[PDB]
């Protein structure tokens, strides 16, 4: 969209004498700007751009450019209003998430995660605009049961972790302490069979494979429980219909009896006088 959190940009390593006027002039090549949140002392703040195209152009055109003897470090700000929604219904659309979670606020975009074949993965990714809407939606969908469609399966909603695969691990950002040297005595390589390394790596591989077996066992248990729970839907639905009908009929018959007795008593006391 326009004026969203994807157009937002984090600017860092600015000179301490930056100005809001020169800040706007700095991005003046890319149309208007949003919230000019800047810190003179620590040298970084929050800036907002207009659209996705302009943000993609400007951040990559502005990084690696020194400014007053300081090579700029501008980065994509990790989105804060993020949610993730799970156990989505078998039939779901982008606009279904855009409209359902529109109740809790403005959904800038929610897009059912899809794999290569086109089938849904079974998860979701919802990015509101503001944080408080995200908190309210998360707590409500935790305490409530946010049904999405006729199929009565509520969607579990969790906060999303920001796995950053852009900056990776630059060399100069590692601690490089005595442990690093202790861990960099010998280069990466294979383990010679029969050595200490090979045996201890066999121990690690056994541990990892047993962990994977445990995870698949949990997956199988949940899958069989879910398949059992989907089949007993009809029986539970019909039983609840029968219970509701029986309670309603009890209520109606008691209402009839009370109306009859009140009419009888009032006519009796009327004719007595």
């Amino acid at each position: 969209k326009t004026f969203t959190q994807r157009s937002r940009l984090f600017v860092g390593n600015l000179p301490p004498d930056i100005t809001e006027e020169e800040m706007r002039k700095l991005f003046e090549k890319y149309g208007k700007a949003g919230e000019v949140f800047i810190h003179k002392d620590k040298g970084f703040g929050f800036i907002r751009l207009e659209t996705r195209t302009l943000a993609e152009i400007a951040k990559v055109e502005l990084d690696n450019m020194p400014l007053r003897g300081k090579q700029l470090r501008v980065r994509f700000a990790c989105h804060s209003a993020s949610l993730t929604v799970r156990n989505l219904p078998q039939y779901v659309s982008n606009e279904l998430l855009e409209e359902a979670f529109s109740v809790f606020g403005q959904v800038e975009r929610a897009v059912v995660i899809v794999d290569d074949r086109g089938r849904p993965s079974g998860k979701g990714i919802v990015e509101f605009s503001g944080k408080p809407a995200a908190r309210k939606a998360l707590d409500r969908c935790s305490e409530g049961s946010f049904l999405l469609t006729t199929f009565p399966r509520p969607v579990t909603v969790e906060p999303m972790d920001q796995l950053d695969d852009e900056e990776g691990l630059p060399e100069k950002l590692v601690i490089k302490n005595q442990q690093f040297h202790k861990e960099r005595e010998q280069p990466p390589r294979f383990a010679q069979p029969g050595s200490f390394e090979y045996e201890y790596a066999m121990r690690w591989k056994a541990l990892i494979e047993m962990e994977k077996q445990q995870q698949d066992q949990v997956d199988r248990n949940i899958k069989e429980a879910r398949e059992k729970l989907e089949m007993e839907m009809e029986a539970a639905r019909h039983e609840h219909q029968v219970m509701l009908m029986r309670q309603d009929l009890m209520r109606r018959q008691e209402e009839l009896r009370r109306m009859e007795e009140l009419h009888n008593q009032e006519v009796q006391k009327r004719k007595q006088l």
Partner: protein, 41 residues
């Protein structure tokens, strides 16, 4: 090792058998629902 191989073979057989039972049961449920909706009309 021998016990582990035997156990995994038994587990695979059990999974296949349970899948067959499950598909039979869901087929019965589908036919049953079809009978119900036929009786409704």
């Amino acid at each position: 090792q021998k016990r582990k191989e035997m156990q995994l073979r038994q587990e695979e057989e059990r999974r296949r058998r349970e899948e067959e039972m499950m598909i039979r049961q869901r087929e019965m449920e589908e036919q049953m629902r079809r009978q119900r909706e036929e009786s409704y009309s």
